[PDB]
């Protein structure tokens, strides 16, 4: 199924879509314009949207740091199930609560 992965969407369309179709805690994954091959998590927090870059080497998936995963689903479900491990410099956690779908 992998319904949270939107294959044909820009970051600004995703950013708008989360503020219409989702709630705080909603999120999705997209293919990333800035670096083809990579992916990007787009999450909603406190009425606004944050974007997180995901490195795909070919060998593994990661967030330019942290735990490394064999597949993208393993990475997304990991950070869903371990909420505190996704933190920003500020100190705030970024929570992947509710997947948004096609």
């Amino acid at each position: 199924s992998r319904r949270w992965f939107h294959p044909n969407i820009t970051g600004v369309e995703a950013e708008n879509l989360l503020l219409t179709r989702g709630v705080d805690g909603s999120f999705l994954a997209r293919p990333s314009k800035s670096n083809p091959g990579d992916f990007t998590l787009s999450v909603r927090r406190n009425g606004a949207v944050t974007h997180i870059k995901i490195q795909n080497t070919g060998d593994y998936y990661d967030l330019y740091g942290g735990e490394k995963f064999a597949t993208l689903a393993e990475l997304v479900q990991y950070y869903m199930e371990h909420h505190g491990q996704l933190k920003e410099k500020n100190g705030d956690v970024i929570e992947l609560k509710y997947p948004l779908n096609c």
């Binding site: 996704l86 933190k87 970024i94």
Partner: peptide
């Protein structure tokens, strides 16, 4: 576009 948040790790 809009910026990508700066993630930190233990």
């Amino acid at each position: 576009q809009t910026e990508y948040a700066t993630i930190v790790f233990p």
